[PDB]
Swiss-Prot record, chain D:
Intrachain disulfide bonds: none
Protein's organism: Escherichia coli (strain K12)
Any one Gene Ontology molecular-function term assigned to this protein's record: acyl binding
Source species taxonomy: Bacteria, Pseudomonadati, Pseudomonadota, Gammaproteobacteria, Enterobacterales
O-(pantetheine 4'-phosphoryl)serine carried by residues: S35
Keywords: Cytoplasm, Fatty acid biosynthesis, Fatty acid metabolism, Lipid biosynthesis, Lipid metabolism, Phosphopantetheine, Phosphoprotein
PTM info: 4'-phosphopantetheine is transferred from CoA to a specific serine of apo-ACP by AcpS. This modification is essential for activity because fatty acids are bound in thioester linkage to the sulfhydryl of the prosthetic group.
GO cellular component, one term: membrane
Cited InterPro entries: ACP, ACP-like_sf, PP-bd_ACP, Ppantetheine_attach_site
Name listed for the protein in its UniProt record: Acyl carrier protein
One of the GO BP terms on file: response to xenobiotic stimulus
């Protein structure tokens, strides 16, 4: 019983962790570029208005 | 060196095929029987040499499959 | 000095226009991913703020 | 036209359906656009018609009807 379940678990965990590591990283990269350019635009906007 | 099992076959696979449990199991498997946890002998055997059996049966164009519930069975391909 | 400063202001204005266009273009593409990740994949799993 | 160019901008900046975006459809509650999403929406509205808006008067805009009202 143990021998079965332990295996199953190992495979589950490895796939999950590696897939999330692979995808979330680039998703956050994109989000961060968009955040950065928006922040630059807002600073430029405020300074221009003032 | 020559005349050495490794030339033709992995040692673990030959060790499995030489076991006394293999003919029974083979016969049954081919007939479509599913193998669960209760028939210890068979199940344990399956577990011990899983990958060798899979590789073996592959020759036939059939998949030796393991369901999540822990039971083994044979699924033939189109070929 | 104010005329000289109105020239810096105009440089900032042109920079701001460029940044504005770039930001909008980024958002347009990112929208598709947002509609595609409505599967409950984004709330915590993908958006790891860490 | 302006009253449909506004929809062109809103739908493609928030990703919501054209049917969803009615005149009275508020961005935050109906369309779901949050702080940064609304900021980008106002920026896109500025870009489409090549105009500029004051900060306070822009932030006062929080609905499709209000959006067009300031646009038209």
């Amino acid at each position: 019983a143990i021998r079965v379940t332990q295996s199953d678990r190992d495979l589950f965990k490895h796939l999950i962790t590696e897939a999330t590591s692979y995808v979330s990283a680039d998703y956050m990269r994109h989000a961060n570029e968009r955040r950065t350019h928006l922040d630059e635009a807002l600073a430029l906007r405020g300074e221009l208005f003032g | 060196s020559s005349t050495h099992i490794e030339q033709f076959m992995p040692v673990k696979l030959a060790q499995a095929l030489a076991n006394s449990l293999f003919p029974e199991l083979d016969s049954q498997l081919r007939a479509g029987r599913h193998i669960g946890i209760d028939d210890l002998d068979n199940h344990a055997f399956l577990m011990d040499f899983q990958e060798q059996l899979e590789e073996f049966y592959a020759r036939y164009n059939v998949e030796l499959i393991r369901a999540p519930e822990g039971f083994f069975y044979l699924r033939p391909r189109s070929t | 000095e104010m005329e000289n400063v109105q020239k810096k202001l105009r440089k900032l204005e042109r920079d701001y226009y460029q940044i504005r266009e770039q930001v909008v273009s980024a958002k347009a593409g990112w929208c598709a991913v947002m509609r595609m990740v409505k599967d409950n994949g984004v709330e915590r799993r993908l958006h790891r703020r860490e | 036209t302006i009253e449909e160019r506004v929809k062109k901008i809103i739908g493609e900046q928030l990703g919501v359906k054209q049917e969803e975006v009615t005149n009275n459809a508020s961005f935050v509650e109906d369309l779901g656009a949050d702080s940064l999403d609304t900021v980008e929406l106002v920026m896109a509205l500025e870009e489409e018609f090549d105009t500029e808006i004051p900060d306070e008067e822009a932030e006062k805009i929080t609905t499709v009807q209000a959006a067009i009202d300031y646009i038209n």
